[PDB]
Design an enzyme around this catalytic site. Structure first.
Site, PDB file in Angstrom:
ATOM      1  N   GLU A   1       0.723  -1.247  -0.017  1.00  0.00           N
ATOM      2  CA  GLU A   1      -0.185   0.020   0.039  1.00  0.00           C
ATOM      3  C   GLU A   1       0.962   1.353   0.022  1.00  0.00           C
ATOM      4  OE1 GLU A   1      -2.012   1.385   3.554  1.00  0.00           O
ATOM      5  OE2 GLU A   1      -3.864   1.707   2.374  1.00  0.00           O
TER       6      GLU A   1
ATOM      7  N   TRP B   1      -8.464  -2.208  -0.447  1.00  0.00           N
ATOM      8  CA  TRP B   1      -9.110  -1.350  -0.883  1.00  0.00           C
ATOM      9  C   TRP B   1     -10.130  -1.524  -1.731  1.00  0.00           C
ATOM     10  CZ3 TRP B   1      -9.015   4.043   0.068  1.00  0.00           C
ATOM     11  CH2 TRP B   1      -8.075   4.425   0.631  1.00  0.00           C
TER      12      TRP B   1
ATOM     13  N   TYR C   1      -5.488   9.669  -1.077  1.00  0.00           N
ATOM     14  CA  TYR C   1      -4.006   9.721  -0.771  1.00  0.00           C
ATOM     15  C   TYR C   1      -3.145   9.789  -1.666  1.00  0.00           C
ATOM     16  CZ  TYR C   1      -6.145   7.842   3.733  1.00  0.00           C
ATOM     17  OH  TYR C   1      -6.838   7.562   4.769  1.00  0.00           O
TER      18      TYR C   1
ATOM     19  N   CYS D   1      -8.244   9.296   6.452  1.00  0.00           N
ATOM     20  CA  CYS D   1      -8.201   9.194   7.742  1.00  0.00           C
ATOM     21  C   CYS D   1      -6.937   9.704   8.434  1.00  0.00           C
ATOM     22  CB  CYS D   1      -8.211   7.586   8.082  1.00  0.00           C
ATOM     23  SG  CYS D   1      -8.744   7.110   9.744  1.00  0.00           S
TER      24      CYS D   1
ATOM     25  N   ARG E   1      -7.482  11.810  11.979  1.00  0.00           N
ATOM     26  CA  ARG E   1      -8.776  12.403  12.352  1.00  0.00           C
ATOM     27  C   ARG E   1      -9.468  11.270  13.251  1.00  0.00           C
ATOM     28  NH1 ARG E   1     -12.845  10.763   9.657  1.00  0.00           N
ATOM     29  NH2 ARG E   1     -12.413   9.805   7.333  1.00  0.00           N
TER      30      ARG E   1
ATOM     31  N   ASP F   1      -9.872   3.350  14.467  1.00  0.00           N
ATOM     32  CA  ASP F   1     -10.419   2.312  14.874  1.00  0.00           C
ATOM     33  C   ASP F   1      -9.242   1.731  15.520  1.00  0.00           C
ATOM     34  OD1 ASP F   1     -10.996  -0.355  15.253  1.00  0.00           O
ATOM     35  OD2 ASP F   1     -12.345  -0.650  13.736  1.00  0.00           O
TER      36      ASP F   1
ATOM     37  N   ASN G   1      -1.586   1.540  10.695  1.00  0.00           N
ATOM     38  CA  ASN G   1      -1.203   2.828  10.502  1.00  0.00           C
ATOM     39  C   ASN G   1       0.197   3.047  11.085  1.00  0.00           C
ATOM     40  OD1 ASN G   1      -1.548   5.862  12.109  1.00  0.00           O
ATOM     41  ND2 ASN G   1      -2.323   5.859  10.149  1.00  0.00           N
TER      42      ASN G   1
END
Lengths: 264, 264
Positions: free
Chosen positions: A58, A80, A94, A146, A166, A169, A177
Site C-alpha cells: 500500500e 481497498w 491519498y 483518515c 482524524r 479504530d 497505521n
C-alpha cells in the site's frame, strides 16, 4: 506495544459511549498522542500477530500516485476492494494528493518530492508537510482521508514525523497505521542519509467498537515482547524506486493473531 | 497556566538547540499535546498580563473571510501589519480558506458553515474539520498557516476542538493561540446549544527563542492564578454575527506583563 496497550486501556477507562458512521456503537476519546522512538525497534504490535505484506504494498502504491487498485490487485492486496468501483478506481485519495495535488491554476503539486527537497536543503524548515486533506476533492474520494496530514522534523541527525489521524479504530486499524508511517520514516531517512528519530502519532476521534471489546481485553492480558528490527536490503536512487523485496523484519515474535469482526 | 508552564519547562529540559527561519537560535521539541477543560475557566495565561482585544478582533475578521486588513486597521489591531502589502492585502490566508477555499472547478467552499451544519445534523461525524492548509495557495499567502488544521467533536452535550499547530513560538505566540481557539469553541458551542468541552492543543516544532530565555525563567517563577471566566453578553443569530462588545472577561488577575523582544 506499551504505548498501544496504554491507549486501549485509556479508551476503556475514559471513553464515552456513542455510535459510528451508522451502526456499531463505540467507546471513544478525543485527542491523544503517543511517541515511538524508532531507534528502540520497529513499532509492529507483538500482542497479536500482524503482517507487513499489505502495508508495504500500500505504501509503495501511495508513493506512485496512481489511485487505481490495479497494482494492489496484481499483488493480491485487497484492503481497498470494498471502496473501489467497477474499474478499480477510488477517486483522488491519498496517493493523488501526495503526488499530484490539483490546483485551481492547472498544476499538480508533488508534496513528496517537495518534502525531500526541504529535508535536503532546508532541514530546519517548520513546514515540511504533506497533506491529504484537499477540501475541494473530498466528495470525489471513495473515502475521506483518515491519516490526513503529516509533518517531518530534523534534529541531531535524526528524522522524526508526526501524523494527525482524524479518526481511528484502535483495534483494527491502528496497528496497520503505525507500521505504515514508521516504514515511511525509515525510507525517507535512508534517502536523506539521516538516522530515524521519533514517530509521533496524534489522533482525533479515537475509538473501540463494541464488538471488539472481548478481543481488546484478551490483547491487554498479554505482555508485549521486544520490538522487531526493520532491515532495508537495498538503497534505491530515490523514494520512488523502492521494491517490496527491499524490506525484511527480524526478531518478530508475536502472540497469536486475533480476528476483528466487522458489521456491514 | 499549569499546562503552559509545564510545556515551557519541557522545552527547557529536553529541547534541542538549533535555529529558525534564518536568525535567532531556538530550543525546540517536536510533538506535544495538552488539554484545557473549558469548564474549568477560560484559558488566558495569568503568569503574565495578556489582553483579548486583538484576539477577538482577529477571530471576527477570520470568520468574515476577507483577508484585507482594513477591518483590523479600523480597530487599531496591528498584528498583521508586518505582513500586509501596500494595499493591506495578505493573500489567501486563514479567513479565505475558512470561508472560501477555492476548488479547481470554480467553487468557494465555506468550511465554517459546513462544520456548523455537521454539528447540528451529524454531531457524531468523525470529519468535522476546518483546514487552512491549502497546498495550491501557499505561495500566494503572506505567511504559511501556523494554526493549520482543527477538528470538532461532540460528546455528553459538550463541544471539544483539537488544533494542529505546525510550529509554535511558545513565549510570544502560544498564549494568543490558545485564547483564540478557546473563544471560537465558546462561540460555536453557543450557536449549537452545546456546553463547552476540551480544547486540545497539538504542536509540531514547538520552540523557545534564545532571547526569550530570561523571560521564560521569570514566568516560571510565578504561580498560576485561577483562570478567568468568559462572558458572552449576547446570543447572535449566527456565527457570523458576533460583535467585539459581546465578549467580556471576569476574574482575570494576572502577574505583570513581560515584553517579548524580537530580532529583525
Amino acid at each position: 506495544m506499551k504505548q498501544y496497550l496504554e491507549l486501549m486501556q485509556k479508551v476503556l477507562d475514559e471513553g464515552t459511549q456513542k455510535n459510528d458512521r451508522t451502526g456499531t456503537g463505540t467507546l471513544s476519546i478525543f485527542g491523544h498522542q503517543m511517541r515511538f522512538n524508532l531507534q528502540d525497534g520497529f513499532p509492529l504490535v507483538t500482542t497479536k500477530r500482524c503482517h507487513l505484506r499489505s502495508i508495504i504494498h500500500e505504501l509503495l502504491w501511495f508513493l506512485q500516485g496512481d489511485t487505481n487498485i490495479a497494482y494492489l490487485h496484481e499483488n493480491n492486496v485487497t484492503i481497498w476492494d470494498e471502496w473501489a468501483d467497477e474499474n478499480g478506481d477510488l477517486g483522488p485519495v491519498y496517493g493523488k494528493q501526495w503526488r499530484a495535488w490539483p490546483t485551481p491554476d492547472g498544476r499538480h503539486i508533488d508534496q513528496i518530492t517537495t518534502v525531500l527537497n526541504q529535508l535536503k536543503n532546508d532541514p530546519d524548515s517548520r513546514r515540511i508537510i504533506v497533506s491529504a486533506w484537499n477540501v475541494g476533492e473530498l466528495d470525489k474520494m471513495a473515502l475521506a482521508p483518515c491519516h490526513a496530514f503529516f509533518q517531518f522534523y530534523v534534529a541531531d541527525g535524526k528524522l522524526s514525523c508526526q501524523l494527525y489521524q482524524r479518526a481511528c479504530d484502535v483495534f483494527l486499524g491502528l496497528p496497520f497505521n503505525i507500521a505504515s508511517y514508521a516504514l515511511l520514516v525509515h525510507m525517507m531517512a535512508q534517502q536523506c542519509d539521516l538516522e530515524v528519530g521519533d514517530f509521533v502519532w496524534t489522533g482525533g476521534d479515537t475509538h473501540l467498537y463494541s464488538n471488539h471489546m472481548d478481543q481488546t481485553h484478551l490483547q491487554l492480558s498479554r505482555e508485549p515482547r521486544p520490538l522487531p528490527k526493520l532491515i532495508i536490503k537495498r538503497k534505491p536512487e530515490s523514494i520512488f524506486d523502492y521494491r517490496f523485496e527491499d524490506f525484511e523484519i527480524e526478531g518478530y515474535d508475536p502472540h497469536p493473531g486475533i480476528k476483528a469482526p466487522v458489521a456491514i
